[PDB]
Amino acid sequence: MITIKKGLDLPIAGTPSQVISDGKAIKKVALLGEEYVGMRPTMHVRVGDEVKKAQILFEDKKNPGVKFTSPVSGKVVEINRGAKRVLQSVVIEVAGDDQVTFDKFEANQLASLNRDAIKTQLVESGLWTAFRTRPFSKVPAIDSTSEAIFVTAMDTNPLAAEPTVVINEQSEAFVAGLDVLSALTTGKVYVCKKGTSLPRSQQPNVEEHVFDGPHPAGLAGTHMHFLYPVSADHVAWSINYQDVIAVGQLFLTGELYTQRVVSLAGPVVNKPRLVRTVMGASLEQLVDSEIMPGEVRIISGSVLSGTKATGPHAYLGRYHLQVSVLREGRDKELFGWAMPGKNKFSVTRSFLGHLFKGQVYNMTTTTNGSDRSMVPIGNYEKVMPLDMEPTLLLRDLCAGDSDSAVRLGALELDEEDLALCTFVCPGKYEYGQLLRECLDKIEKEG
Amino acid sequence: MSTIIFGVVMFTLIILALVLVILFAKSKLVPTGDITISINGDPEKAIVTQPGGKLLTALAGAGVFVSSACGGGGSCGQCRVKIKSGGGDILPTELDHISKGEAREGERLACQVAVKADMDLELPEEIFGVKKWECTVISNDNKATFIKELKLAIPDGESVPFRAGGYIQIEAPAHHVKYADFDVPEKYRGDWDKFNLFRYESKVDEPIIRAYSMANYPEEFGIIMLNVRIATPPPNNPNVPPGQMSSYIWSLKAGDKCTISGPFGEFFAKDTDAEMVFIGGGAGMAPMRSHIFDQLKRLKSKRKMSYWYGARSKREMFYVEDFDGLAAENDNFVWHCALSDPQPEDNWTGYTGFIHNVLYENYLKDHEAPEDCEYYMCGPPMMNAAVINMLKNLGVEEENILLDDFGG
Amino acid sequence: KELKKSVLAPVLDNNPIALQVLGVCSALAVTTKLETAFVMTLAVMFVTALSNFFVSLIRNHIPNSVRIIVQMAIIASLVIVVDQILKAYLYDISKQLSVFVGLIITNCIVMGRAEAFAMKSEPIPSFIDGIGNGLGYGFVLMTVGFFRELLGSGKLFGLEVLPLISNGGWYQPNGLMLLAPSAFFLIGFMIWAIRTFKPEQVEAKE
Amino acid sequence: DSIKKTLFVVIALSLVCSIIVSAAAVGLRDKQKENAALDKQSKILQVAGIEAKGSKQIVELFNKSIEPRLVDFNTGDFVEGDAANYDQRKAAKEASESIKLTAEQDKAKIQRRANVGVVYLVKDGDKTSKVILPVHGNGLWSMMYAFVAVETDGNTVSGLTYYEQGETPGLGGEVENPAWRAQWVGKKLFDENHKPAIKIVKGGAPQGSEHGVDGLSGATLTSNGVQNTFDFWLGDMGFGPFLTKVRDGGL
Amino acid sequence: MEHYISLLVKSIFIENMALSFFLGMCTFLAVSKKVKTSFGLGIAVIVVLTISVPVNNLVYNLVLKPDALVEGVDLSFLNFITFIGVIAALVQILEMILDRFFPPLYNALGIFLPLITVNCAIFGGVSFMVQRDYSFAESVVYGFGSGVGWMLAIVALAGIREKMKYSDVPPGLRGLGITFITAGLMALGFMSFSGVQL
Amino acid sequence: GLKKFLEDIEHHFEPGGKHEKWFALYEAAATLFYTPGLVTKRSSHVRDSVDLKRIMIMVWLAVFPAMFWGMYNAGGQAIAALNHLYSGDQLAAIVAGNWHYWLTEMLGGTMSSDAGWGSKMLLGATYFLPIYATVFIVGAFWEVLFCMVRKHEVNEGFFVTSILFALIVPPTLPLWQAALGITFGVVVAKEVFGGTGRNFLNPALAGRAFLFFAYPAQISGDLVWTAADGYSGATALSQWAQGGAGALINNATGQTITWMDAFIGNIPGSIGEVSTLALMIGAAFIVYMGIASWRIIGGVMIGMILLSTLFNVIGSDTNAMFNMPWHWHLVLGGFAFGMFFMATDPVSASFTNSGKWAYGILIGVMCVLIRVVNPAYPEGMMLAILFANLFAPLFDHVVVERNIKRRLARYG
Numbered sequence A: 001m002i003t004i005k006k007g008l009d010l011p012i013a014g015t016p017s018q019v020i021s022d023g024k025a026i027k028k029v030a031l032l033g034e035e036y037v038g039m040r041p042t043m044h045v046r047v048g049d050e051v052k053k054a055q056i057l058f059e060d061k062k063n064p065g066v067k068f069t070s071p072v073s074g075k076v077v078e079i080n081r082g083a084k085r086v087l088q089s090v091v092i093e094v095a096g097d098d099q100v101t102f103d104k105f106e107a108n109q110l111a112s113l114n115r116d117a118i119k120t121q122l123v124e125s126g127l128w129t130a131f132r133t134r135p136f137s138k139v140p141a142i143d144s145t146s147e148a149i150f151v152t153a154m155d156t157n158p159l160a161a162e163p164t165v166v167i168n169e170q171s172e173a174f175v176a177g178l179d180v181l182s183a184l185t186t187g188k189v190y191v192c193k194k195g196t197s198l199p200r201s202q203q204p205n206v207e208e209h210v211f212d213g214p215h216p217a218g219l220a221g222t223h224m225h226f227l228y229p230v231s232a233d234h235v236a237w238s239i240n241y242q243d244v245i246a247v248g249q250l251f252l253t254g255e256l257y258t259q260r261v262v263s264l265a266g267p268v269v270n271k272p273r274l275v276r277t278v279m280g281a282s283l284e285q286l287v288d289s290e291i292m293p294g295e296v297r298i299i300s301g302s303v304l305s306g307t308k309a310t311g312p313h314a315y316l317g318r319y320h321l322q323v324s325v326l327r328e329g330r331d332k333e334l335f336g337w338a339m340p341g342k343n344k345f346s347v348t349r350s351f352l353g354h355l356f357k358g359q360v361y362n363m364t365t366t367t368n369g370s371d372r373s374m375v376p377i378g379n380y381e382k383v384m385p386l387d388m389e390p391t392l393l394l395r396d397l398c399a400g401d402s403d404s405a406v407r408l409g410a411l412e413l414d415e416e417d418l419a420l421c422t423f424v425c426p427g428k429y430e431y432g433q434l435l436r437e438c439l440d441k442i443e444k445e446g
Numbered sequence B: 001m002s003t004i005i006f007g008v009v010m011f012t013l014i015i016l017a018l019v020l021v022i023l024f025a026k027s028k029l030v031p032t033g034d035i036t037i038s039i040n041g042d043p044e045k046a047i048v049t050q051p052g053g054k055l056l057t058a059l060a061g062a063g064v065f066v067s068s069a070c071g072g073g074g075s076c077g078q079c080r081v082k083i084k085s086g087g088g089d090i091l092p093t094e095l096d097h098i099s100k101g102e103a104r105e106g107e108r109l110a111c112q113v114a115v116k117a118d119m120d121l122e123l124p125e126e127i128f129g130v131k132k133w134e135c136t137v138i139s140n141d142n143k144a145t146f147i148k149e150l151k152l153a154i155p156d157g158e159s160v161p162f163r164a165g166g167y168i169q170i171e172a173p174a175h176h177v178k179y180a181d182f183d184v185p186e187k188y189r190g191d192w193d194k195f196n197l198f199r200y201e202s203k204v205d206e207p208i209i210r211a212y213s214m215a216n217y218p219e220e221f222g223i224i225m226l227n228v229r230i231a232t233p234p235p236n237n238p239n240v241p242p243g244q245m246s247s248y249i250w251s252l253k254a255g256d257k258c259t260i261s262g263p264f265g266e267f268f269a270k271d272t273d274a275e276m277v278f279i280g281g282g283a284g285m286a287p288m289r290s291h292i293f294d295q296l297k298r299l300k301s302k303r304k305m306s307y308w309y310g311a312r313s314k315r316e317m318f319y320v321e322d323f324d325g326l327a328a329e330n331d332n333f334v335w336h337c338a339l340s341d342p343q344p345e346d347n348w349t350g351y352t353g354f355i356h357n358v359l360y361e362n363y364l365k366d367h368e369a370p371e372d373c374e375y376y377m378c379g380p381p382m383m384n385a386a387v388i389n390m391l392k393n394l395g396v397e398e399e400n401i402l403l404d405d406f407g408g
Numbered sequence C: 001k002e003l004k005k006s007v008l009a010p011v012l013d014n015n016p017i018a019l020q021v022l023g024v025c026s027a028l029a030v031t032t033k034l035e036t037a038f039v040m041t042l043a044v045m046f047v048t049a050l051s052n053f054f055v056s057l058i059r060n061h062i063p064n065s066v067r068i069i070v071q072m073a074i075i076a077s078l079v080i081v082v083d084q085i086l087k088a089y090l091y092d093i094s095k096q097l098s099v100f101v102g103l104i105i106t107n108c109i110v111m112g113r114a115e116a117f118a119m120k121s122e123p124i125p126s127f128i129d130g131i132g133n134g135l136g137y138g139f140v141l142m143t144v145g146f147f148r149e150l151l152g153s154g155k156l157f158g159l160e161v162l163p164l165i166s167n168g169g170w171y172q173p174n175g176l177m178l179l180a181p182s183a184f185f186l187i188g189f190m191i192w193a194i195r196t197f198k199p200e201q202v203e204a205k206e
Numbered sequence D: 001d002s003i004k005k006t007l008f009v010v011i012a013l014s015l016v017c018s019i020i021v022s023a024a025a026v027g028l029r030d031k032q033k034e035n036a037a038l039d040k041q042s043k044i045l046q047v048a049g050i051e052a053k054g055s056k057q058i059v060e061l062f063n064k065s066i067e068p069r070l071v072d073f074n075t076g077d078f079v080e081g082d083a084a085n086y087d088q089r090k091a092a093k094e095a096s097e098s099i100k101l102t103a104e105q106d107k108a109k110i111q112r113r114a115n116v117g118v119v120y121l122v123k124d125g126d127k128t129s130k131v132i133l134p135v136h137g138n139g140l141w142s143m144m145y146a147f148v149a150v151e152t153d154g155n156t157v158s159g160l161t162y163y164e165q166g167e168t169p170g171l172g173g174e175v176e177n178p179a180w181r182a183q184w185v186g187k188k189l190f191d192e193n194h195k196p197a198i199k200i201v202k203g204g205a206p207q208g209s210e211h212g213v214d215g216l217s218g219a220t221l222t223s224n225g226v227q228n229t230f231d232f233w234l235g236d237m238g239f240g241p242f243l244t245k246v247r248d249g250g251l
Numbered sequence E: 001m002e003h004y005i006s007l008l009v010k011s012i013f014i015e016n017m018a019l020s021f022f023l024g025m026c027t028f029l030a031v032s033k034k035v036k037t038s039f040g041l042g043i044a045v046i047v048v049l050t051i052s053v054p055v056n057n058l059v060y061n062l063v064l065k066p067d068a069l070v071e072g073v074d075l076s077f078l079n080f081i082t083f084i085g086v087i088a089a090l091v092q093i094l095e096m097i098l099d100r101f102f103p104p105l106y107n108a109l110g111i112f113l114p115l116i117t118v119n120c121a122i123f124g125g126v127s128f129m130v131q132r133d134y135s136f137a138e139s140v141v142y143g144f145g146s147g148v149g150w151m152l153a154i155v156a157l158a159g160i161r162e163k164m165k166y167s168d169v170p171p172g173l174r175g176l177g178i179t180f181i182t183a184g185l186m187a188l189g190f191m192s193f194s195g196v197q198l
Numbered sequence F: 001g002l003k004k005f006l007e008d009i010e011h012h013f014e015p016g017g018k019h020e021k022w023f024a025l026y027e028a029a030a031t032l033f034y035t036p037g038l039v040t041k042r043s044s045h046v047r048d049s050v051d052l053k054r055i056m057i058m059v060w061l062a063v064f065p066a067m068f069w070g071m072y073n074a075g076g077q078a079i080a081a082l083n084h085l086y087s088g089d090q091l092a093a094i095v096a097g098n099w100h101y102w103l104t105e106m107l108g109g110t111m112s113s114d115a116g117w118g119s120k121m122l123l124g125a126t127y128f129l130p131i132y133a134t135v136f137i138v139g140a141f142w143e144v145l146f147c148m149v150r151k152h153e154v155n156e157g158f159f160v161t162s163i164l165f166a167l168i169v170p171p172t173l174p175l176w177q178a179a180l181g182i183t184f185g186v187v188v189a190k191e192v193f194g195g196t197g198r199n200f201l202n203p204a205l206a207g208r209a210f211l212f213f214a215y216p217a218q219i220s221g222d223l224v225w226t227a228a229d230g231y232s233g234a235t236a237l238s239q240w241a242q243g244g245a246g247a248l249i250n251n252a253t254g255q256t257i258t259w260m261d262a263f264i265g266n267i268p269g270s271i272g273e274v275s276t277l278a279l280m281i282g283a284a285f286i287v288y289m290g291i292a293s294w295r296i297i298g299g300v301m302i303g304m305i306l307l308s309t310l311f312n313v314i315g316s317d318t319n320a321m322f323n324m325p326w327h328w329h330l331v332l333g334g335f336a337f338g339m340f341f342m343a344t345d346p347v348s349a350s351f352t353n354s355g356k357w358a359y360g361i362l363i364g365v366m367c368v369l370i371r372v373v374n375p376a377y378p379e380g381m382m383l384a385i386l387f388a389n390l391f392a393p394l395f396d397h398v399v400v401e402r403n404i405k406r407r408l409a410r411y412g
């Protein structure tokens, strides 16, 4: 067991009740084009076309052979594009139940299937995009393999759902997906989890590892750092538990399984809870009559890392398992920076808030100050548990020294790995953008 | 007085002793034997020289220039070679032209690498077919007001192996020429006499070498031809003379003796099924014609194609009797031209203005998926920049944009 | 007139200290008095000019193996003669210059110009180049010395300009102007001003 | 190319350069030595109370108005030797020509004393009017050297100048201030019982006194060195044995 | 042992050749861009200085000083030529040795060598040795300590300049001017040893 | 309404307005009075409450007890010395000839020996306040000039630099010298590097070093540490250097300086350094808040203790500074002030946890070393901190290189 000590469990209000319930009716879904790293699409559909479930919508120019498919049967109603004609989303209006089907196998045959057959089925069904690669968090090339596949069976994000509740309803599918992953991998499968019990695969190369402590104890980056360090010559793959259930369902029934269970929570949600939805569901329709009046922001994912769901982006992301809602903090306060902030959160002890243990805050989207240069009072070390130098790495990212950042350990990181550092920055830097720019340069230079 | 003699003797003795010690150290330490360099692993075509200096000195003796276009400056960056053996490291001065991935592949600049030790070299695509030729000028006439069409003959009916869009090496001797001697006809002379371009002259005291692009496709057997523009000085500082090589080429006529060599190129078309769009202007007509003829006559392809040309006036354009014939014999080709200087005697009723705006406003703004097309480019640098910006705003990534810029 | 073009270029266009990095040690050391700055400027100018002249005279015969030995022999002979003359006629100033009369040999300007220009040029052009580089060096030395001496002692060439409180005046000298950090800061601000008025010399961002 | 050519070129160049260098170096030695001597003679004339302008006048006045002499510290008697070319500073470093002082005796922190020291007698016709004693001691930053002119009674100071010191110009360099140097004239080196009595007084000496002089303002660490210089050089290990002879009319 | 330890400490800190005497400034300012490049240059300086000072001590004591060869004859006007000749020949010999036998040591420290003959630190160290009249062992220790101090100073400057990757310097100060100001500030802090009577 | 006024006059400072060149000052005032009111654009949609404004205001408040005790102590020392030296009509004439004295008496105070804490504090204020005002105004001029020329926004940090500079000078410092010192500190040490967060030296100590080496006669010696006309008196560190613990006597009152006196702050010296207790009370708050580095403070203490005990064990017959123990090193001079408020500057210190220990240890070792074996200077805290600023990045380099080794071994 690994115990994380440096971290932060954000005490935000509106904690979901871990009980699953039916969700609202969904009439639109979409695939978000900008959430895939390095993707340049080639469109296989145009507005007005009718599509089936698992039918291809577009391919990737820079990743040949990878197919992005439709999660529902219906009609293509919108193909949204932005600056420089970048694809934002492809919106399908639900209608009918047509689908493309694949091969199905018995539960005991899954552990010994051919790797090429597994890869063909996944790529054709479009479920191949559930995987991501560290470094660079990209969809793996269909011709490559990896020694380590990490399954994320825990969630430490604030207001996140409980993976145990979801998995206990789909034990057979979870185990079948683990068997398929064991056959797919060239080395081992790492099932990262908390201390409680889960369904287990009987294969010898599937291993369970328990992680303890606050956020980011539940991140695949932390798990990789502690069990299989990654570099330019060691590449790992990551996939979350619901995608594993989807893989198991795919290889058990020959059909693409697009059901989801997401957490709908936040300070402005009347009844925070877990809701059954569908991949890419419309968040505007999902949160209908679920929120308090006023100006609010709907986030696809966590408040630490997520996508502002407005306009053409108002759809559930591919890699997101929750929806967060909170108010917009546009208030101006007289000498608000100098008040004794009983109701102000901070990782430092400059406010009265930390003296009240167990207090939850109705946090908003305000930035508590203006942009400034870095004055390192030592907040990053309090929240970064990995074996790196946070201040030096962050200053390398700010300065744009990609070569130095790589040496200091940028290749091991995702945007979600610096969310807490962005959170606690007195200068209000946003480090995910800088990390992504650095990684883009590293990939460009070869 | 004795002190003077002592000082002289001691000064001389000390200097001589130091010199002798350093000479002995050099004789014992530095090697004096010969070293060898190999190419593509062959036991033949090896080169043996004394150690020291750049690799270019050794490779120049055998005539393997690898398109080395200058002895200094290095703005082109063409001087790269893959070194296979564990030789010297890549110096800090090479990373501007060689990426980190290429350096990991062994790419090195021949002009910087020191050859003081044995090394092994590999040259891509077996370029050993490069050769020098003795050629006769077939025709050197003009089709416009500032460009001239040079044709060359290859003896015994032989044909040089090449691919469309490539360029060749060309050399000239010491010469002096004056612009009044050129054969500009009456219709084009109207512009020359306005600036009095006949007043200019140029010279050089030693032979020179340059690179120029070819204007024919593989099945145009037996000849090599090029399109050359004049190189008059800028008007703000007219005291300087015009260009050397262009003036030299403009002087020759039918039957004259000339020498060429070094057919190279990296502007070759891709082999996909996507649409092809050809945008050109001014003197860049040569590679555009080469590619258009190649894809339509030799390969006989059915891919969609179109050629957009930016001219100056109705008397500045040429090869329309070829492009219109192509557009009629093949339904997969279309030609359009726009000019920036329509004089009243033209009464032009077609497109006007810079070609990029015409292209955007007539074809691309309503194109179904412009990012899937392939764009082949050649022309003035500023118009290239305008076109590249217009294509950037349409979401076309660099992999689908190709350009062979004249003059770098 | 190419001669005046060549002599004046190293003053502001290619200044040895402000654009090239050469001859900084003496600039830091001998600029607390304008008289010593002036004498050092003249000595460096003379030595550089004559070294360039002779090296270019024998440039075609220098054996490549011991060219450094030959060049340093010439330079050291000239500097030794200069040292003898200074100790014979300017004893006090030679005392003040201390070990830096000998360090004219390793003053980077002399060797830099001898190697870069003299080995590749004719005698008279090499002499002119040496004179011009000496002028460029003297510009910085004299300007730094002016401020250092004036603000550190209220004097110029030893003549009283700002009466001192000790002598009964009104000015309190700055003690930091008599130490190296003042020269460092002054040269830095000089480079700032020069590259403000001639922005073509600004270095590219890394 | 040929080692023969290399050797020929280097040898010829060395011959020319060496001839020039040696001729120049040997031709100017006398003038350099004259400059060095005149530098010292100017200071000695200055402290002697004689005005001289120019090298010629300095030489003329020094030759006829000053008579260098050698003195043995242990016995205070004059010694044979060429006083005009003696180098006490180097003689203090040679083992046979000097002694190592004791931690108690080394009050001025000089660490050594030469066996014989040079003194300069000031002439007035054939009569001797003053004797100039060279003294030195450690300050806060450097070793400080001075000349002190004493009358023929062996007690009264006629003047004092520090001709070599390296203290801070504002705090410790004020030993060279003419106004501070003027205070020394008329002071008595010894009390009525012939013990050293020069005192550097912090905060200013009492008005009208004949044993005390003002200390350097804000520079006590240099005033201490100045005090120690005289504490040592007026004692038995310095010019005390010679000054008793001088007091007894031995001039 | 205390005498030589005191000499070494004085050479390194109390009398740092880079930030107390201010010699070698041209390369101290130009090559301070990267820590490890400065480290290699400093190692080369250490070697050259610690071999140069003793050899010049021997030559001066056996030939040049007054009454060394014949009585009444001194050759001390040859000091400069002898010093610089020894330094140049030694630098070239060691440059050839490193490239010939130890290519990996050449890549580390030999590549910097052509210019370190013209480096005021070496010549000034030899001159100070002659002025102070050291012994042979004292000369060895003094040269080694001076080289070590110069290396320390240049490596500290390189560290500062690498820390400055996050700075925003005005365009007219980028490079030479700001490095000059940084060196002045370093000299400001090194004055803590000024009054030490070691 | 200030809120309505600020947004009413906004259009004047927008581009093309009447006052478009004073936009930096306008926005500074606006965000001083109210908060920006902005939201998050990207990345973490929630942010921590802390900001540079609160960091700087906390550091500024931490020194208030020290500043007030410093004013009171300066006044008391001056009055005691004046009454020791003069009395009667001579004292009346001395008072009439100094504005610091006759202003105090005009505002209702007294300069007699029975003066109370109010009179002493007022007399100290008439020395402290002019220095602080001059420093702040002169430095703000340069800050605003740089911001306007480079179109930056005026940030916080000079708010702390100014007070820290004003608290580390003798009560008698000339105002033109104070102006020159702050000019040097702000411009040469901070602004040319890009401003707050982008330098490597301590701006406040850089100006103090400038004064120290340019005008030593006004920031050293016996004539500057007590603001009494014509009074000459040494202070504890000088007296120890002269004669050991037995030499610690306050000549203004004839009493013996004790450890309790030095700890409470009943001794002359720089305005804000004297009270170790008052400095400790302030430092505890900012250490608890997590703004100051207890690793740096512990390193400084470790180094001081180790080197002082080594000197005590070695011993000496002629140097009385060898036998001063660590608990006496603690309470004399500016050691406590430097350790608590100047060695903890985040920008000038090491950025690594391991590096901070070495940084503090070096500062302490250098301070004790300069105190003991350097006869020119009685104190060494300023020089020690300025010297350790040069080597902090080298400690960072060593630590990060070890980290890179671990990483390449696939364990990090």
Ligand SMILES: Cc1cc2nc3c(=O)[nH]c(=O)nc-3n(C[C@H](O)[C@H](O)[C@H](O)COP(=O)(O)OP(=O)(O)OC[C@H]3O[C@@H](n4cnc5c(N)ncnc54)[C@H](O)[C@@H]3O)c2cc1C
Binding pocket: B167, B210, B211, B212, B213, B214, B226, B227, B228, B229, B231, B232, B233, B234, B240, B241, B242, B243, B244, B245, B246, B247, B283, B286, B405, B406, B407, B408
């Ligand atoms: C691979 C390749 C292929 C090419 N193919 C073609 C082709 O097919 N057709 C074509 O037309 N072009 C082509 N070019 C471009 C052409 O080679 C050049 O643009 C140019 O025309 C070459 O002219 P030149 O060598 O005769 O004259 P150059 O002597 O190269 O021209 C020198 C110019 O610089 C000016 N100059 C010199 N000194 C100064 C000074 N101090 N200040 C100001 N001005 C100064 C001269 O007056 C003159 O204008 C090609 C270029 C490349 C790289």
Ligand SMILES: Cc1cc2nc3c(=O)[nH]c(=O)nc-3n(C[C@H](O)[C@H](O)[C@H](O)COP(=O)(O)O)c2cc1C
Binding pocket: D140, D141, D167, D168, D171, D172, D173, D217, D218, D219, D220, D221, D222, D223, F212, F213, F216, F220, F221, F222, F223, F234, F376, F377, F378
């Ligand atoms: C930069 C600097 C240089 C100093 N130089 C000297 C000096 O040369 N001589 C000296 O006596 N004091 C000098 N001092 C002052 C001493 O440090 C010390 O304060 C003084 O000797 C105390 O004298 P006092 O006891 O009479 O007050 C200097 C101070 C500073 C800051």
Ligand SMILES: Cc1cc2nc3c(=O)[nH]c(=O)nc-3n(C[C@H](O)[C@H](O)[C@H](O)COP(=O)(O)O)c2cc1C
Binding pocket: F167, F168, F225, F234, F235, F236, F237, F238, F239, F268, F269, F270, F273, F333, F334, F335, F337, F338, F342, F377, F378, F379, F380, F381, F382, F383, F384
């Ligand atoms: C932060 C700080 C740093 C100081 N640094 C020095 C210093 O480096 N050198 C010095 O002589 N005095 C320095 N001082 C001043 C002394 O601490 C003290 O105020 C002064 O020397 C008074 O004399 P004393 O040392 O006898 O008490 C500093 C003061 C402070 C507050």
Ligand code: FES
Binding pocket: B068, B069, B070, B073, B074, B075, B076, B077, B078, B079, B109, B111
């Ligand atoms: S051709 Fe570019 S470096 Fe030689």
Ligand code: FES
Binding pocket: C022, C023, C024, C025, C026, C106, C107, C108, C109, E023, E024, E025, E026, E027, E118, E119, E120, E121
């Ligand atoms: S002048 Fe001293 S190293 Fe260049």
Ligand SMILES: [Ca+2]
Binding pocket: D088, D089, D090, D092
């Ligand atoms: Ca002596």
